[PDB]
Amino acid sequence: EVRILFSTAKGESHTHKAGFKQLFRRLRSTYRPDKVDKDDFTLDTLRSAHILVLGGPKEKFTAPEVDMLKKFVKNGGSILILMSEGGEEKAGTNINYFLEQFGMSVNNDAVVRTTHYKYLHPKEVLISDGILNRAVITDEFRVFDGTGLEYVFPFGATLSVQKPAVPVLSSGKIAYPMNRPVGAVWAQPGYGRIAVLGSCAMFDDKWLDKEENSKIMDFFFKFLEPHSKIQLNDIDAEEPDV
């Protein structure tokens, strides 16, 4: 019914093989996930699918590959792009050339905690007030208002977001840099949709089950699925607290 392709075509760090195993498994409950490899990375393969996932690409896209992605969305397909700390510079890709055409860009930075949590490494950030659009929901040393859901954002980068895109998740107040977009989307009635997340690790085998990460996961695939019922809150979209 809903077909999801997990790409391995650009050396993705997170795939069915390694990184997104539990994610792949949990998507079978409601969707039909598959892989797409380098030889199969074409418009014909994509046209039969509904959601394309790029789980941390580590190689450059050619100009025809970028046109292909644009065509896919234009014909109603959805794209979920997940990046990581260091952005595209460290990863060795050029996906921002696609993303900036839709008002989005992955930054070359790394989100870290500014407060103490015992069991987290500094780049594993607990975010309790980072919900920018409510449609997502609907002393010791160093120890709608955007709350309502808590998640862990491990080893991620921030995003630069402008119209026509809309930011939906932020780094929250106890991270550096604070209150910067960490998740964003693009949509147009009659066409496909794009979602960008600055972290692959937040959906990996360790973190998908922690806090409410899988609820964030639930939101994004419901948002990206064909004829989605998800509508962004318009107040939050026009005036996001970020």
C-alpha atoms as a PDB file:
ATOM      1  CA  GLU A   1       0.000   0.000   0.000  1.00  0.00           C
ATOM      2  CA  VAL A   2       2.664   2.546   1.064  1.00  0.00           C
ATOM      3  CA  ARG A   3       6.095   1.738  -0.334  1.00  0.00           C
ATOM      4  CA  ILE A   4       9.224   3.128   1.332  1.00  0.00           C
ATOM      5  CA  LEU A   5      12.681   2.948  -0.225  1.00  0.00           C
ATOM      6  CA  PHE A   6      15.751   3.104   1.993  1.00  0.00           C
ATOM      7  CA  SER A   7      18.628   4.205  -0.216  1.00  0.00           C
ATOM      8  CA  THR A   8      22.131   2.733  -0.129  1.00  0.00           C
ATOM      9  CA  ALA A   9      23.025   4.434  -3.413  1.00  0.00           C
ATOM     10  CA  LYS A  10      25.166   7.202  -1.877  1.00  0.00           C
ATOM     11  CA  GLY A  11      27.006   5.275   0.812  1.00  0.00           C
ATOM     12  CA  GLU A  12      24.327   5.907   3.446  1.00  0.00           C
ATOM     13  CA  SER A  13      25.559   5.365   7.015  1.00  0.00           C
ATOM     14  CA  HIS A  14      22.082   4.318   8.151  1.00  0.00           C
ATOM     15  CA  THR A  15      20.268   1.590   6.177  1.00  0.00           C
ATOM     16  CA  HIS A  16      18.376  -1.708   6.568  1.00  0.00           C
ATOM     17  CA  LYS A  17      21.749  -3.480   6.783  1.00  0.00           C
ATOM     18  CA  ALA A  18      23.305  -1.224   9.417  1.00  0.00           C
ATOM     19  CA  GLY A  19      21.749   1.553  11.490  1.00  0.00           C
ATOM     20  CA  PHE A  20      18.055   1.465  10.574  1.00  0.00           C
ATOM     21  CA  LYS A  21      17.340  -2.208  11.359  1.00  0.00           C
ATOM     22  CA  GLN A  22      14.770  -1.540  14.107  1.00  0.00           C
ATOM     23  CA  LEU A  23      13.375   1.356  12.055  1.00  0.00           C
ATOM     24  CA  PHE A  24      12.870  -0.894   9.005  1.00  0.00           C
ATOM     25  CA  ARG A  25      11.220  -3.458  11.271  1.00  0.00           C
ATOM     26  CA  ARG A  26       8.817  -1.004  12.895  1.00  0.00           C
ATOM     27  CA  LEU A  27       7.735   0.415   9.545  1.00  0.00           C
ATOM     28  CA  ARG A  28       6.511  -3.003   8.298  1.00  0.00           C
ATOM     29  CA  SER A  29       3.654  -2.758  10.807  1.00  0.00           C
ATOM     30  CA  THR A  30       1.949  -0.096   8.665  1.00  0.00           C
ATOM     31  CA  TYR A  31       4.074   0.326   5.537  1.00  0.00           C
ATOM     32  CA  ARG A  32       6.044  -1.701   3.043  1.00  0.00           C
ATOM     33  CA  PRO A  33       9.774  -0.845   3.259  1.00  0.00           C
ATOM     34  CA  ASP A  34      12.403  -1.856   0.732  1.00  0.00           C
ATOM     35  CA  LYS A  35      15.946  -0.887  -0.266  1.00  0.00           C
ATOM     36  CA  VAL A  36      17.194   0.908  -3.382  1.00  0.00           C
ATOM     37  CA  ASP A  37      20.858   0.504  -4.315  1.00  0.00           C
ATOM     38  CA  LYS A  38      23.165   2.398  -6.702  1.00  0.00           C
ATOM     39  CA  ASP A  39      22.252   0.624  -9.961  1.00  0.00           C
ATOM     40  CA  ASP A  40      18.584   1.061  -9.127  1.00  0.00           C
ATOM     41  CA  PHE A  41      18.798   4.765  -8.186  1.00  0.00           C
ATOM     42  CA  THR A  42      16.673   5.950 -11.139  1.00  0.00           C
ATOM     43  CA  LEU A  43      13.389   7.770 -11.740  1.00  0.00           C
ATOM     44  CA  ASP A  44      11.779   4.471 -12.823  1.00  0.00           C
ATOM     45  CA  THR A  45      12.587   2.799  -9.515  1.00  0.00           C
ATOM     46  CA  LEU A  46      11.486   5.866  -7.554  1.00  0.00           C
ATOM     47  CA  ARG A  47       8.239   6.409  -9.494  1.00  0.00           C
ATOM     48  CA  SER A  48       6.834   3.141  -8.105  1.00  0.00           C
ATOM     49  CA  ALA A  49       7.545   4.189  -4.527  1.00  0.00           C
ATOM     50  CA  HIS A  50       5.834   6.630  -2.179  1.00  0.00           C
ATOM     51  CA  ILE A  51       8.554   7.678   0.319  1.00  0.00           C
ATOM     52  CA  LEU A  52      12.305   7.862  -0.319  1.00  0.00           C
ATOM     53  CA  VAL A  53      14.620   7.822   2.702  1.00  0.00           C
ATOM     54  CA  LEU A  54      18.206   9.033   2.514  1.00  0.00           C
ATOM     55  CA  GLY A  55      19.725   7.901   5.793  1.00  0.00           C
ATOM     56  CA  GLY A  56      22.920   9.943   5.939  1.00  0.00           C
ATOM     57  CA  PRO A  57      24.379  10.150   2.409  1.00  0.00           C
ATOM     58  CA  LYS A  58      28.187  10.224   2.262  1.00  0.00           C
ATOM     59  CA  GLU A  59      28.656  10.929  -1.438  1.00  0.00           C
ATOM     60  CA  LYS A  60      27.825  13.660  -3.880  1.00  0.00           C
ATOM     61  CA  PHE A  61      24.684  13.782  -6.013  1.00  0.00           C
ATOM     62  CA  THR A  62      25.058  14.470  -9.703  1.00  0.00           C
ATOM     63  CA  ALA A  63      22.984  17.210 -11.297  1.00  0.00           C
ATOM     64  CA  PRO A  64      20.786  14.611 -13.007  1.00  0.00           C
ATOM     65  CA  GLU A  65      20.234  12.887  -9.646  1.00  0.00           C
ATOM     66  CA  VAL A  66      19.067  16.226  -8.234  1.00  0.00           C
ATOM     67  CA  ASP A  67      16.650  16.764 -11.167  1.00  0.00           C
ATOM     68  CA  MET A  68      15.457  13.206 -10.590  1.00  0.00           C
ATOM     69  CA  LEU A  69      14.679  13.964  -6.937  1.00  0.00           C
ATOM     70  CA  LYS A  70      12.807  17.135  -7.928  1.00  0.00           C
ATOM     71  CA  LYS A  71      10.782  15.166 -10.520  1.00  0.00           C
ATOM     72  CA  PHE A  72       9.928  12.487  -7.948  1.00  0.00           C
ATOM     73  CA  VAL A  73       8.448  15.076  -5.562  1.00  0.00           C
ATOM     74  CA  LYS A  74       6.681  16.876  -8.385  1.00  0.00           C
ATOM     75  CA  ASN A  75       4.945  13.585  -9.272  1.00  0.00           C
ATOM     76  CA  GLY A  76       3.798  13.271  -5.674  1.00  0.00           C
ATOM     77  CA  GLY A  77       6.608  11.299  -4.089  1.00  0.00           C
ATOM     78  CA  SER A  78       7.921  12.176  -0.638  1.00  0.00           C
ATOM     79  CA  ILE A  79      11.520  12.456   0.568  1.00  0.00           C
ATOM     80  CA  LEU A  80      12.931  12.082   4.079  1.00  0.00           C
ATOM     81  CA  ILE A  81      16.524  13.254   4.357  1.00  0.00           C
ATOM     82  CA  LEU A  82      18.498  12.631   7.536  1.00  0.00           C
ATOM     83  CA  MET A  83      21.911  14.167   8.073  1.00  0.00           C
ATOM     84  CA  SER A  84      24.372  14.271  10.929  1.00  0.00           C
ATOM     85  CA  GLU A  85      26.795  16.418  12.938  1.00  0.00           C
ATOM     86  CA  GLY A  86      29.252  18.196  10.686  1.00  0.00           C
ATOM     87  CA  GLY A  87      26.536  18.518   8.074  1.00  0.00           C
ATOM     88  CA  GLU A  88      27.357  17.902   4.424  1.00  0.00           C
ATOM     89  CA  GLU A  89      31.023  19.090   4.694  1.00  0.00           C
ATOM     90  CA  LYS A  90      32.014  16.255   7.009  1.00  0.00           C
ATOM     91  CA  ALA A  91      29.699  13.771   5.260  1.00  0.00           C
ATOM     92  CA  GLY A  92      31.185  14.538   1.835  1.00  0.00           C
ATOM     93  CA  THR A  93      27.920  15.154   0.012  1.00  0.00           C
ATOM     94  CA  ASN A  94      26.252  18.137  -1.691  1.00  0.00           C
ATOM     95  CA  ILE A  95      22.567  17.590  -0.828  1.00  0.00           C
ATOM     96  CA  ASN A  96      22.136  21.277   0.108  1.00  0.00           C
ATOM     97  CA  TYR A  97      22.065  22.023  -3.593  1.00  0.00           C
ATOM     98  CA  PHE A  98      18.737  20.136  -3.670  1.00  0.00           C
ATOM     99  CA  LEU A  99      17.514  21.306  -0.232  1.00  0.00           C
ATOM    100  CA  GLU A 100      18.140  25.036  -0.679  1.00  0.00           C
ATOM    101  CA  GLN A 101      15.807  25.071  -3.675  1.00  0.00           C
ATOM    102  CA  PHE A 102      13.051  24.214  -1.177  1.00  0.00           C
ATOM    103  CA  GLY A 103      14.242  26.718   1.465  1.00  0.00           C
ATOM    104  CA  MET A 104      16.297  24.324   3.618  1.00  0.00           C
ATOM    105  CA  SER A 105      19.979  23.723   4.343  1.00  0.00           C
ATOM    106  CA  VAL A 106      21.942  21.458   6.665  1.00  0.00           C
ATOM    107  CA  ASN A 107      24.521  23.366   8.722  1.00  0.00           C
ATOM    108  CA  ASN A 108      28.120  22.337   9.399  1.00  0.00           C
ATOM    109  CA  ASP A 109      27.799  22.182  13.154  1.00  0.00           C
ATOM    110  CA  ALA A 110      27.206  19.808  16.072  1.00  0.00           C
ATOM    111  CA  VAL A 111      24.534  20.169  18.747  1.00  0.00           C
ATOM    112  CA  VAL A 112      25.732  19.589  22.325  1.00  0.00           C
ATOM    113  CA  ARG A 113      24.246  19.712  25.777  1.00  0.00           C
ATOM    114  CA  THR A 114      24.730  22.802  27.896  1.00  0.00           C
ATOM    115  CA  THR A 115      23.403  21.028  31.008  1.00  0.00           C
ATOM    116  CA  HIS A 116      24.315  17.866  32.886  1.00  0.00           C
ATOM    117  CA  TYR A 117      22.736  14.482  32.252  1.00  0.00           C
ATOM    118  CA  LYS A 118      24.577  11.475  33.684  1.00  0.00           C
ATOM    119  CA  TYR A 119      24.086   8.850  30.968  1.00  0.00           C
ATOM    120  CA  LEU A 120      24.362  11.034  27.846  1.00  0.00           C
ATOM    121  CA  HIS A 121      27.527  11.909  25.894  1.00  0.00           C
ATOM    122  CA  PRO A 122      27.720  15.669  25.158  1.00  0.00           C
ATOM    123  CA  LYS A 123      26.447  15.281  21.565  1.00  0.00           C
ATOM    124  CA  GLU A 124      23.443  13.223  22.768  1.00  0.00           C
ATOM    125  CA  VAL A 125      20.950  15.957  23.513  1.00  0.00           C
ATOM    126  CA  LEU A 126      17.703  15.583  25.475  1.00  0.00           C
ATOM    127  CA  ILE A 127      15.199  18.078  24.101  1.00  0.00           C
ATOM    128  CA  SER A 128      12.021  18.771  26.087  1.00  0.00           C
ATOM    129  CA  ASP A 129      10.875  22.071  24.594  1.00  0.00           C
ATOM    130  CA  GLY A 130      11.849  21.639  20.946  1.00  0.00           C
ATOM    131  CA  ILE A 131       8.465  21.171  19.274  1.00  0.00           C
ATOM    132  CA  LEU A 132       7.962  24.057  16.844  1.00  0.00           C
ATOM    133  CA  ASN A 133       4.701  22.867  15.284  1.00  0.00           C
ATOM    134  CA  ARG A 134       2.034  21.367  17.496  1.00  0.00           C
ATOM    135  CA  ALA A 135       0.912  19.104  14.616  1.00  0.00           C
ATOM    136  CA  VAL A 136       3.930  17.007  15.617  1.00  0.00           C
ATOM    137  CA  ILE A 137       2.162  16.205  18.884  1.00  0.00           C
ATOM    138  CA  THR A 138      -1.439  15.976  17.654  1.00  0.00           C
ATOM    139  CA  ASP A 139      22.302  22.444  42.822  1.00  0.00           C
ATOM    140  CA  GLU A 140      24.493  19.958  40.969  1.00  0.00           C
ATOM    141  CA  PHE A 141      27.288  21.042  38.617  1.00  0.00           C
ATOM    142  CA  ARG A 142      25.600  22.321  35.432  1.00  0.00           C
ATOM    143  CA  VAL A 143      22.165  21.266  36.743  1.00  0.00           C
ATOM    144  CA  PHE A 144       1.477  25.918  23.262  1.00  0.00           C
ATOM    145  CA  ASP A 145       5.024  26.569  24.453  1.00  0.00           C
ATOM    146  CA  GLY A 146       6.928  23.925  22.469  1.00  0.00           C
ATOM    147  CA  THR A 147       6.680  21.314  25.201  1.00  0.00           C
ATOM    148  CA  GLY A 148       4.503  18.209  25.165  1.00  0.00           C
ATOM    149  CA  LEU A 149       7.022  15.720  23.816  1.00  0.00           C
ATOM    150  CA  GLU A 150      10.584  14.783  24.836  1.00  0.00           C
ATOM    151  CA  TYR A 151      13.165  13.253  22.519  1.00  0.00           C
ATOM    152  CA  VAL A 152      16.873  12.578  22.155  1.00  0.00           C
ATOM    153  CA  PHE A 153      18.797  14.180  19.354  1.00  0.00           C
ATOM    154  CA  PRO A 154      22.116  12.368  19.150  1.00  0.00           C
ATOM    155  CA  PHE A 155      25.091  13.522  17.073  1.00  0.00           C
ATOM    156  CA  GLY A 156      23.090  15.934  14.938  1.00  0.00           C
ATOM    157  CA  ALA A 157      23.446  19.218  13.064  1.00  0.00           C
ATOM    158  CA  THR A 158      21.061  22.205  12.910  1.00  0.00           C
ATOM    159  CA  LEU A 159      19.251  23.361   9.789  1.00  0.00           C
ATOM    160  CA  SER A 160      18.798  26.728   8.173  1.00  0.00           C
ATOM    161  CA  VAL A 161      15.127  27.067   7.214  1.00  0.00           C
ATOM    162  CA  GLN A 162      13.157  29.747   5.371  1.00  0.00           C
ATOM    163  CA  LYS A 163       9.914  29.962   3.404  1.00  0.00           C
ATOM    164  CA  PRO A 164       8.753  28.071   1.472  1.00  0.00           C
ATOM    165  CA  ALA A 165       9.908  25.483   4.037  1.00  0.00           C
ATOM    166  CA  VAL A 166       8.691  25.310   7.640  1.00  0.00           C
ATOM    167  CA  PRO A 167      10.694  24.265  10.692  1.00  0.00           C
ATOM    168  CA  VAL A 168       9.013  21.694  12.943  1.00  0.00           C
ATOM    169  CA  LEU A 169      11.640  20.655  15.529  1.00  0.00           C
ATOM    170  CA  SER A 170      14.245  22.758  17.344  1.00  0.00           C
ATOM    171  CA  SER A 171      17.323  22.152  19.456  1.00  0.00           C
ATOM    172  CA  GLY A 172      15.498  23.575  22.474  1.00  0.00           C
ATOM    173  CA  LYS A 173      16.865  25.677  25.308  1.00  0.00           C
ATOM    174  CA  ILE A 174      19.559  23.481  26.918  1.00  0.00           C
ATOM    175  CA  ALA A 175      21.576  22.860  23.798  1.00  0.00           C
ATOM    176  CA  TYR A 176      24.248  24.724  21.876  1.00  0.00           C
ATOM    177  CA  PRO A 177      23.169  26.325  19.654  1.00  0.00           C
ATOM    178  CA  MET A 178      19.870  26.952  21.406  1.00  0.00           C
ATOM    179  CA  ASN A 179      16.472  27.134  19.704  1.00  0.00           C
ATOM    180  CA  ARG A 180      17.730  26.397  16.215  1.00  0.00           C
ATOM    181  CA  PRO A 181      15.796  24.236  13.747  1.00  0.00           C
ATOM    182  CA  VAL A 182      16.743  20.608  13.784  1.00  0.00           C
ATOM    183  CA  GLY A 183      13.822  19.326  11.685  1.00  0.00           C
ATOM    184  CA  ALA A 184      11.995  20.963   8.799  1.00  0.00           C
ATOM    185  CA  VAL A 185       9.454  20.213   6.028  1.00  0.00           C
ATOM    186  CA  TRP A 186       8.312  21.402   2.607  1.00  0.00           C
ATOM    187  CA  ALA A 187       4.856  20.710   1.175  1.00  0.00           C
ATOM    188  CA  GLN A 188       2.626  21.998  -1.592  1.00  0.00           C
ATOM    189  CA  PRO A 189      -0.994  20.897  -2.198  1.00  0.00           C
ATOM    190  CA  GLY A 190      -1.137  18.558  -5.188  1.00  0.00           C
ATOM    191  CA  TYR A 191       2.540  17.615  -4.959  1.00  0.00           C
ATOM    192  CA  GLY A 192       5.001  15.589  -2.933  1.00  0.00           C
ATOM    193  CA  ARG A 193       6.600  16.561   0.357  1.00  0.00           C
ATOM    194  CA  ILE A 194      10.108  16.811   1.817  1.00  0.00           C
ATOM    195  CA  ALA A 195      11.258  16.385   5.416  1.00  0.00           C
ATOM    196  CA  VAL A 196      14.772  16.999   6.709  1.00  0.00           C
ATOM    197  CA  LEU A 197      16.230  15.906  10.036  1.00  0.00           C
ATOM    198  CA  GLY A 198      19.678  16.877  11.277  1.00  0.00           C
ATOM    199  CA  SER A 199      20.223  13.446  12.907  1.00  0.00           C
ATOM    200  CA  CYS A 200      20.185   9.820  11.632  1.00  0.00           C
ATOM    201  CA  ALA A 201      21.080   8.501  15.022  1.00  0.00           C
ATOM    202  CA  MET A 202      17.790   9.629  16.568  1.00  0.00           C
ATOM    203  CA  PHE A 203      16.046   6.770  14.703  1.00  0.00           C
ATOM    204  CA  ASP A 204      18.776   4.158  15.112  1.00  0.00           C
ATOM    205  CA  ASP A 205      18.544   0.889  17.008  1.00  0.00           C
ATOM    206  CA  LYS A 206      19.643   2.472  20.256  1.00  0.00           C
ATOM    207  CA  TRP A 207      17.508   5.617  20.225  1.00  0.00           C
ATOM    208  CA  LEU A 208      14.300   4.811  18.321  1.00  0.00           C
ATOM    209  CA  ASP A 209      12.770   3.297  21.496  1.00  0.00           C
ATOM    210  CA  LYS A 210      14.041   5.921  23.941  1.00  0.00           C
ATOM    211  CA  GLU A 211      11.914   8.814  25.233  1.00  0.00           C
ATOM    212  CA  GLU A 212       9.404   9.696  22.507  1.00  0.00           C
ATOM    213  CA  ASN A 213      11.678   9.347  19.471  1.00  0.00           C
ATOM    214  CA  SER A 214       9.412   6.795  17.783  1.00  0.00           C
ATOM    215  CA  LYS A 215       6.481   9.205  18.109  1.00  0.00           C
ATOM    216  CA  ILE A 216       8.574  11.746  16.181  1.00  0.00           C
ATOM    217  CA  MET A 217       9.265   8.938  13.733  1.00  0.00           C
ATOM    218  CA  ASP A 218       5.515   8.224  13.564  1.00  0.00           C
ATOM    219  CA  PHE A 219       4.827  11.890  12.771  1.00  0.00           C
ATOM    220  CA  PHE A 220       7.241  12.167   9.868  1.00  0.00           C
ATOM    221  CA  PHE A 221       6.081   9.070   7.966  1.00  0.00           C
ATOM    222  CA  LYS A 222       2.414   9.979   8.516  1.00  0.00           C
ATOM    223  CA  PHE A 223       3.294  13.438   7.155  1.00  0.00           C
ATOM    224  CA  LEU A 224       5.121  12.035   4.145  1.00  0.00           C
ATOM    225  CA  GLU A 225       2.673   9.199   3.240  1.00  0.00           C
ATOM    226  CA  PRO A 226       0.364   9.450   0.172  1.00  0.00           C
ATOM    227  CA  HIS A 227      -2.701  11.656   0.717  1.00  0.00           C
ATOM    228  CA  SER A 228      -1.517  12.424   4.229  1.00  0.00           C
ATOM    229  CA  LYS A 229      -4.118  13.578   6.748  1.00  0.00           C
ATOM    230  CA  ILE A 230      -1.418  15.619   8.552  1.00  0.00           C
ATOM    231  CA  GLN A 231      -1.901  19.365   8.378  1.00  0.00           C
ATOM    232  CA  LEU A 232       0.671  21.698   9.944  1.00  0.00           C
ATOM    233  CA  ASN A 233      -0.612  24.165  12.488  1.00  0.00           C
ATOM    234  CA  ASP A 234      -0.760  27.428  10.537  1.00  0.00           C
ATOM    235  CA  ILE A 235       0.023  29.742  13.464  1.00  0.00           C
ATOM    236  CA  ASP A 236       3.103  27.722  14.366  1.00  0.00           C
ATOM    237  CA  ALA A 237       4.149  27.624  10.717  1.00  0.00           C
ATOM    238  CA  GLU A 238       3.931  31.347  10.123  1.00  0.00           C
ATOM    239  CA  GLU A 239       5.393  32.319  13.476  1.00  0.00           C
ATOM    240  CA  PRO A 240       7.605  29.427  14.729  1.00  0.00           C
ATOM    241  CA  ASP A 241       9.339  29.942  18.112  1.00  0.00           C
ATOM    242  CA  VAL A 242      12.896  29.357  16.789  1.00  0.00           C
END
